[PDB]
Design a binder for these strands. Sequence first.
DNA 1: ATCGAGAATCCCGGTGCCGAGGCCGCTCAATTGGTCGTAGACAGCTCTAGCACCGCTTAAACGCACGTACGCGCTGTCCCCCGCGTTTTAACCGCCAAGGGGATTACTCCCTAGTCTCCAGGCACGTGTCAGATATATACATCCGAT
DNA 2: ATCGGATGTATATATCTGACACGTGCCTGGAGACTAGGGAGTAATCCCCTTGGCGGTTAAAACGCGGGGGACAGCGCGTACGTGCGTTTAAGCGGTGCTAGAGCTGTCTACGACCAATTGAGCGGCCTCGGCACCGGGATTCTCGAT
Lengths: 82, 83, 148, 99, 99, 85, 93, 94, 109, 108
Amino acid sequence: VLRDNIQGITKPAIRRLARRGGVKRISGLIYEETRGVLKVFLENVIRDAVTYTEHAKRKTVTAMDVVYALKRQGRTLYGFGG
Amino acid sequence: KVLRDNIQGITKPAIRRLARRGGVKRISGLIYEETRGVLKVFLENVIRDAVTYTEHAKRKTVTAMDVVYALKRQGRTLYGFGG
Amino acid sequence: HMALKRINKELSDLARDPPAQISAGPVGDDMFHWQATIMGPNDSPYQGGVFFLTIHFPTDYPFKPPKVAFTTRIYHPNINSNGSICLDILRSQWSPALTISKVLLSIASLLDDPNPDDPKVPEIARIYKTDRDKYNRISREWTQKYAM
Amino acid sequence: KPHRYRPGTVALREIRRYQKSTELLIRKLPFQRLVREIAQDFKTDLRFQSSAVMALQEACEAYLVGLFEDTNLCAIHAKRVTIMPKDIQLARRIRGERA
Amino acid sequence: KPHRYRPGTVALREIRRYQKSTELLIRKLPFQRLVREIAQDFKTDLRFQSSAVMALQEACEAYLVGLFEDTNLCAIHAKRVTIMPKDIQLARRIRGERA
Amino acid sequence: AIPSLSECQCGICMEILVEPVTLPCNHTLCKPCFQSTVEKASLCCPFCRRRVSSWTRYHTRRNSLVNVELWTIIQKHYPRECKLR
Amino acid sequence: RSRKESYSIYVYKVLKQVHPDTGISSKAMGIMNSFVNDIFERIAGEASRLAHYNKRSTITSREIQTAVRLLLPGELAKHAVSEGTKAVTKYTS
Amino acid sequence: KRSRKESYSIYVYKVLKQVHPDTGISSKAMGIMNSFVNDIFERIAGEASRLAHYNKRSTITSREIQTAVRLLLPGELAKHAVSEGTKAVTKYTS
Amino acid sequence: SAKACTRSSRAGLQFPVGRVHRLLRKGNYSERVGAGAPVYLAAVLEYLTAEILELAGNAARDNKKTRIIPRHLQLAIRNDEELNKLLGRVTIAQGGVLPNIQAVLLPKK
Amino acid sequence: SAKACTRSSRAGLQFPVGRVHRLLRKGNYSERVGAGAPVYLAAVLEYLTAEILELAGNAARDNKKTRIIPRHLQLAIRNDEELNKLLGRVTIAQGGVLPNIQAVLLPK
DNA sequence: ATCGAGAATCCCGGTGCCGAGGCCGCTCAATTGGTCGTAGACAGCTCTAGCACCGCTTAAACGCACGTACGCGCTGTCCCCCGCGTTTTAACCGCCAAGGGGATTACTCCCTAGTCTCCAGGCACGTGTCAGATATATACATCCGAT
DNA sequence: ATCGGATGTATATATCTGACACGTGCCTGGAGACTAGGGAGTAATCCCCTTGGCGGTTAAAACGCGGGGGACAGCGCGTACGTGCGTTTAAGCGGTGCTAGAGCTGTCTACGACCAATTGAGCGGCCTCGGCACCGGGATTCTCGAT
Ligand SMILES: [Zn+2]
Ligand SMILES: [Zn+2]
């Protein structure tokens, strides 16, 4: 069992993502909002990945399951298969 | 039988009504030309695909099904005309 | 015409400088049609033979390749008895920069060394791979009774 | 002496009126002429089923209503109540329509 | 006497540095732990390929970078340079992600 | 300064260069020669078969096919051939 | 002439099953037909892709069930899965 | 040994050795290019299938592929892709 | 079941199982369709239809009418959260929009 | 064209006509497949591949390298307008983003 | 308008290592040849609805004027992000070890396609009547200037 | 905080019209019975890679501090937009006429699927040498406090 691992997405990591995004100055309440939206996105993708894995009677979430889950939602990813 | 500058038939009152249905309360004076341009772009994009669909079937009339198929291809499904 | 001008220049370059072991000319009155003749080089099993060939220039030129055919028959993997040869220049790798002299020199080079990667005739290549002596003697006798 | 409403009440009245009805808001003949003009721009001598023009009109009006909703939110975000072309451009950019 | 950069220059330097590289920006172990936590929320006693976790990280990072681009545009639209939660909310609402 | 007429000669059509175009592989040829090759041939270099699929699109979109720095020299320094060609 | 099939009679049967008093116009019937066709295409395509991914050649009932779980949102998916399972269980005996 | 898995690596390298005869390609880049080829294949084939089913046909010909290319690709990429395909089919037939 | 009545009645449905089976077989989906797929698919389709029709009938009765027009379907779809999520990109002809006005636009007290 | 050679070389392609034909036949697309469809599809795919590879190689040459990596593919795709529109929803792994900064943020 | 010191970034030369490119062996998938059933191409005919024109109301569009309230710029306060230095935490790397479950192979059986016969469910067409739209006349809620 | 006009919107009643709901004929598509075969279920085996652990080093995170620049609120100007009125325009409706083209039917021929023998294209495994990563020192260039 694991608890409260959303705090491993630290303040500097979100700052680096913003810097790549082209952001010059960041407020102080951005980090919690970013953690929430990232958690929602991960939940949405991982749910479909696990559904694809369970349909195939497997117990490891392969890379193809993740690729198909991403492609289902219009987020096609190149470089891992497909 | 050519047609010229018919986009002025999208009058200012019509755009004000379209804005009112969207909940807009106050409208700047330069909104109308920008809206006309946006509508022209959208119409060209849809009619191009509809005409391609009607040319493939060796037909000469644009049916409702061609328009529905074009709209669904662009990602905007339309209910009430078939399909 | 532009094509006609191209043949006129090529005529000037060809007439001022003959190629090695190559001859060519216009077969008929028209400037489109062509004929040429080749001989087997010294380091070849087809030595001593004389071989004629016909050339036809399409209407569009040099953008389209010219048709080249062999009247006689030779013992090569790339040759077919009907007159078609397996060169990349004829259909796929044709280039407007290439000239008639250049393609005939390429034909001579192909005669020097076989390229059985894409052979029209099946049985010749396998005989070449399995045993070279039978290939050589068959080529020699067929050149003796057909090339001369 | 004549009675008139302060600027803003009639606009709200019209907003409440047009969100309750379902009819089309663009006159039929000008839209039909515009559709025919663009079509002859693409392929000449085309005939149009009436249902085709009706479907095109419905799609266009729904698209513009949605665009104006997004534009209103964009205008409100910048402490305003008037919509201006930069709001339309920002809404179209974020939607990915022009990027 | 000690040297100090005026506030705003190291930020531009970081922007220029991080838009020239291609490496991942989130630590691998915390992201792996978070992915495992969510998965065991969904189905218990699961296993993950390394390629699966890597693909999830790439997708999440790309999504967040695009979201921050849209947020920056929203912030500039309102005559600011800071990004605030309402900017993220407006960008997501226009994109249709939160409705 | 001025190259000789031997190197100012198109090999595709055996004539003087008119509106010369130079491919990314540095093979100069007539603009009509290039247009004919693109329309008919396989959209590659006639000399070394170095295909330029997007180069032609990119330059025809902006009308920059002609190697103007060489075209000006050819026209100004050798006015005799250009008028009759 | 030509015969054009549609789901109109079944939609009317379901309407009379739910609301015994209300009728339905023609435009609403066209909209319901379009909706049924659209959902059919969605579920069938998802099932086909699921079958192709696993190197199967059949569209069994579990392919349809997984497609339903993938497309429909939470409570809708749960209720749809329950209804389909009940129908298949009743059909087999 | 592991079972055979087909891919477009050999043909992609053959094409790369024409545009740039002195440039290599990494392995991850080859994976990306293979994914791109598969994706575009699926797009065109699916659009052609829908096109043929719409017209109550049963055969996917070159015409369906041409119309699918016209529908999917952008304005100026389609005008060249159609030319390449038509030239290839004309050369292959005769 | 008795294996003698109509297939829809055997499965206990109103939607056709035979037509669904034929559309699955001739639709270019898979090589060979199983035997229980049409029943499951017809059940799902009928459930969704019943849901939407019930909500639309509620709206129509709220509007004092005994018929369902496209507006009574637009209201029902847009008001329900999950049915709105499912039909997110869909345009309904003659449907209108849900009425709402931003609180900033309302008059000052 | 004349027969008795590999099926791709008749069309002049490098992509495989036979494999594309099999993929179209076994892909559950349609009941029957014409004889001239695989050639057309192979030609289109090869054209797109060459179009991407040329720009990727140009970017790699610009970066002083003699080997194409995913960053060069991302640069080539994003800079071109048509290719950016075609591959719009696609994500390239290890590709980064294009360098741009809004003119408001620059120091005055 | 500038000069200069501290600091970050770009170039250049030398060393090393691992993965990209080429080669060899092999097995299975594409090629070739022959046959057959049917998809669709073409010609002919019907009749539906898309286009064009004319005349009349009246509804919506257009142009003008007045005034107000909202956009936009300016100033001022203050507090909260930013840049920098110090300490503390845990990520990253390399190594070893076990066994879970993914991937392949062989055997068999039962579930699905294909074919023939038959019949009833649903589709097109025709008919009646009542749900809803429109016209007309009151009742009440709401806005606005003035106390 | 009201009060009265004044306007707009909601409610109750007659009527009348065309679209909805039902009924009839029938024909085509679905149901019933039977046969053949291959797809998928099930068991057994191999070995790959996923998990778990330990020790170290060091790059990144957390914390605190001083301060300047950006967010935010308040004022004032004036200009652009809303509301109302009179006028001009072309949309909307009806009615009629014509024929282009969509849609259906009948013939038939050429193209595409199916099957079997055969061999070479392309994949798996190996090996090596050059391109790229890294280190270390120097040159170049923006940045900021002080003029
Ligand atoms: Zn020339
Ligand atoms: Zn060249």
